[PDB]
Amino acid sequence: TVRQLESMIRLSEAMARMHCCDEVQPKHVKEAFRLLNKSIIRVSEYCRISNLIVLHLRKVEEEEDESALKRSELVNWYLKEIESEIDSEEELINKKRIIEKVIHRLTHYDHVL
Amino acid sequence: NQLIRTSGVVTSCTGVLPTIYQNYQRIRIQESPGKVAAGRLPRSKDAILLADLVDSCKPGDEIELTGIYHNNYDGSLNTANGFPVFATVILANHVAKKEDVKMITSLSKDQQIGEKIFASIAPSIYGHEDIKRGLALALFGGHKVRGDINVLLCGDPGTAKSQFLKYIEKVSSRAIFTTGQGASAVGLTAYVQRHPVSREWTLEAGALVLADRGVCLIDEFDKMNDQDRTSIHEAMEQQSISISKAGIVTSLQARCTVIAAANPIGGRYDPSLTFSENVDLTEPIISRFDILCVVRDTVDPVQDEMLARFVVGSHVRHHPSNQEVLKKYIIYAKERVHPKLNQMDQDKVAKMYSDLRKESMATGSIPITVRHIESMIRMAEAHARIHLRDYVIEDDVNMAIRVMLESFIDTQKFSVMRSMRKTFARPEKDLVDKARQINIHNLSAFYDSELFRM
């Protein structure tokens, strides 16, 4: 949600009110960035329905067309299914990195049969 | 102790209600109208009818009230309730029984401003194209020539999207926020409380009555109590209380444009089960929504980028640093434009939509209801009211198509991507369909010469 944008705006009043010395040094700039970055992060969807129900029911037909499974063919057949549905192809590659950790967790826990 | 000139509206009559207390009755009266300056809550009037104006008062009379406010507080015996801050007994003495408008009107007919008018309709957040259509229809709000509009939004309360309806009161003349349970006095719903020995039972006056031939705005519709739903279910169907037993007859007017927004229960579509087939609720209440719009696109940082900068720029203006002309343009128009109909062209108008219905009956089993169409016909009505150009442009035709496609998404499983590709990519009820074949609404048009005699 965007509401934190108002909150982070409130943060700036503490910083500016502290010095009020009408002087800027580069040292205060580098040190400030490191503190904020670590603290802040810790403190229908097409992806959510394809993996759990579609891929379970999709592998029956795909196996009759392909004799084996290849990492090269995985992205090739997926593109033809979602042609002209999303005008954003660059974001697909981001899905590649995430699912690899997801799918390996599913094998030991047997969540997808 | 001075004669006072003021104005007011009679809201309701107490004929339907059942010896010291019997001499008088109780009525709910307001004086302050909806305005930006009227934002601070005023003191409500409670008038008392001493058996003089009973049955002689009818809703919808813009009348003026004049009199003297004597504080002859009859409750000196301390056996009743009391009046608000304006502590005075209010007697009734006047009820009738039977300009910048012109300068703006000159600019209203002008076509130079008539071109950019639909490109500035939604400047606050720029929203979505469907929402503007609903807002424009609501602004105009358009014998038995009536109708209701169900505008649906799909977001979440934390985002100001839920609060987007708050901006309407700047333009709307009558907006009251219910917030659900515990609204201001009567929240359009009737309720009964236990009263002491000598007090008057309460006749519930909703904002429905106060906006007769007006517009009433409802917020957080799905957060109301289950008990309120039972009472309101019947009234909403007829927008009144009608009894045809020929023994007891009464009518209470409620003719505002019901504007409300539904709130999704929990997550949007996180559960994997059916949305329509997994509801324990009653069918007729849910089916009051004419359009079921679904949100388009999920992650669009570029679109989300604009809104953030608006917030940042907005906060700049408010900090210290050392146009009513446009508001009334749309509102005033809905009162003056009343075109007429051509007898030889009435069939052609209705002919076009009838073709679209019969197309859906080829592959299916009555899967389309006329009721959804019933709203679509009244929606096109505002188009002629705005331009008066006698035709509809193909630019608007594409936009109205997007309305229907969203509805099919929510009700059908995501497998809609296989059967409806071509549309997307590119016996009482039976008798009603018969009328569309001849394009005659009146079922008593045979020998209408004898109806005039009566």
UniProtKB/Swiss-Prot annotation, chain A:
Modified residues (Phosphoserine): S88
Post-translational modification: O-glycosylated (O-GlcNAcylated), in a cell cycle-dependent manner.
Localization terms from the record: Nucleus; Chromosome
Result of altering E89 to A/D: Impairs interaction with CTD1
Protein family (similarity comment): Belongs to the MCM family.
Protein name per Swiss-Prot or TrEMBL: DNA replication licensing factor MCM6
Disulfide bond sites: none
Gene designation: MCM6
Outcome after substituting L92A: Impairs interaction with CTD1
Other comment: Early fractionation of eukaryotic MCM proteins yielded a variety of dimeric, trimeric and tetrameric complexes with unclear biological significance. Specifically a MCM467 subcomplex is shown to have in vitro helicase activity which is inhibited by the MCM2 subunit. The MCM2-7 hexamer is the proposed physiological active complex.
Residues bound to ADP: R3, E6
Residue numbers of N6-acetyllysine PTMs: K27
Chain's role: Acts as a component of the MCM2-7 complex (MCM complex) which is the replicative helicase essential for 'once per cell cycle' DNA replication initiation and elongation in eukaryotic cells. Core component of CDC45-MCM-GINS (CMG) helicase, the molecular machine that unwinds template DNA during replication, and around which the replisome is built.
Subunit field text: Component of the MCM2-7 complex. The complex forms a toroidal hexameric ring with the proposed subunit order MCM2-MCM6-MCM4-MCM7-MCM3-MCM5. Component of the CMG helicase complex, a hexameric ring of related MCM2-7 subunits stabilized by CDC45 and the tetrameric GINS complex. May interact with MCM10. Interacts with TIPIN. Interacts with CDT1. Interacts with MCMBP. Interacts with DDI2.
Taxonomic source organism: Homo sapiens (Human)
Curated annotation (Swiss-Prot), chain B:
Cellular localization per UniProt: Nucleus; Chromosome
Modification comment: Phosphorylation by the CDC7-DBF4 complex during G1/S phase is required for the initiation of DNA replication.
Catalytic activity as recorded in UniProt: ATP + H2O = ADP + phosphate + H(+)
A GO cellular component annotation in the UniProt record: chromosome, telomeric region
Residues of the MCM domain: 113-311
Function noted in UniProt: Acts as a component of the MCM2-7 complex (MCM complex) which is the replicative helicase essential for 'once per cell cycle' DNA replication initiation and elongation in eukaryotic cells. Core component of CDC45-MCM-GINS (CMG) helicase, the molecular machine that unwinds template DNA during replication, and around which the replisome is built.
Other remarks on this protein: Early fractionation of eukaryotic MCM proteins yielded a variety of dimeric, trimeric and tetrameric complexes with unclear biological significance. Specifically a MCM467 subcomplex is shown to have in vitro helicase activity which is inhibited by the MCM2 subunit. The MCM2-7 hexamer is the proposed physiological active complex.
Protein name (Swiss-Prot/TrEMBL): DNA replication licensing factor MCM2
Residues of the full protein shown: 303 to 888 of 904
